[PDB]
Amino acid sequence: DELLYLPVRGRETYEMLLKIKESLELMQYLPQHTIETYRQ
Amino acid sequence: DELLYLPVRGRETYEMLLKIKESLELMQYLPQHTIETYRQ
Amino acid sequence: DELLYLPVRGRETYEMLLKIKESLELMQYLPQHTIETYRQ
Amino acid sequence: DELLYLPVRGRETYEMLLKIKESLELMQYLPQHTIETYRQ
């Protein structure tokens, strides 16, 4: 599952894309059930 | 802390913005320490 | 092409998701060629 | 205005973050007036 590199001009954007990236990656630390109970 | 409504034209976009929204909200279920240990 | 509604808790998030949504929608105002010349 | 580098694990994510990044950068090719007329 590839390690790819995204160049970002602008710290404001970079920090936003970073935010999004992390929160997406950090979701695998939650049980599938929690993520499901959060939706309903 | 306001409840706001974002109208989305397109299911492909909506599902992306949804994805991002959830993963951002679902991060409060993780310890601040986990989020920190994930960064380093 | 559906009009869907995304509820957002938090103005900081809403404004981010809004930003992303707009910039994605506003890209249809550019020529496909511009978007392509921007990539290369 | 810094050039920063965001490493992404996963092509699906990378392509999403790329999408967002581009559409945000590609908005400077539109007149401020267009972006404003799009909002109202």
Residue numbers in the entry:
A (entry chain A), B (entry chain A), C (entry chain A), D (entry chain A): 359 to 398
Excerpt from the publication:
The transcription factors p53, p63 and p73 play an important role in cancer prevention, development and longevity. The three proteins share a similar domain organization, being composed of structured DNA-binding domain (DBD) and tetramerization domain flanked by intrinsically disordered regions. Tetramers are formed via a short tetramerization domain that follows the DBD, with a short flexible linker region separating the two domains. Here, we report crystal structures of different p63 tetramerization domain variants, showing not only marked similarity to p73 but also small differences that may be important for regulating the function of p63 in vivo.
We then systematically truncated the C-terminal region, which significantly improved the crystal quality, and we were able to solve the structure of p63(359–402). The crystal structure of the long variant was solved at a resolution of 2.15 Å. The crystals belonged to space group P422 and contained one monomer in the asymmetric unit. Like its family members, p63 forms dimers of dimers with D2 symmetry. The monomers consist of a β-strand followed by two helices, H1 and H2, the latter being absent in the p53 homolog. Tetramers are formed via largely hydrophobic H1–H1 interactions of two primary dimers and H2-mediated contacts. The H2 helices from one primary dimer reach across and clasp the adjacent primary dimer, with the two primary dimers packing in approximately orthogonal fashion via their H1 helices. Helix H2, which is essential for the stability of the tetramer, forms both hydrophobic and polar intersubunit contacts: the latter comprise a hydrogen bond between Tyr396 and Glu383′ and a salt bridge between Arg397 and Glu380′. The last four residues of the construct used for crystallization, Gln399 to Gln402, were not resolved in the crystal structure, indicating a high degree of flexibility.
